[PDB]
Design a protein around this ligand. Sequence first.
Ligand code: ZN
Ligand code: ZN
Length: 71
Amino acid sequence: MELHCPQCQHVLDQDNGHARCRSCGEFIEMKALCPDCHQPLQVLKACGAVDYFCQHGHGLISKKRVEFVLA
Ligand SMILES: [Zn+2]
Ligand SMILES: [Zn+2]
């Protein structure tokens, strides 16, 4: 069933930190927050690989554990 929009109610096509409205046309970007912080994660860019570091003192957070909010 996936996630639906709270406005242009349709399917949200979600990838890494990004959600494009399929069937809507709209483009949405999402923030990667640490669940235990609610502050943004440090996007560690290694060109090919990207790590999400909890800038605060918790360690590394995977994109399957991160909390994505509407940006
Ligand atoms: Zn939509
Ligand atoms: Zn944290």
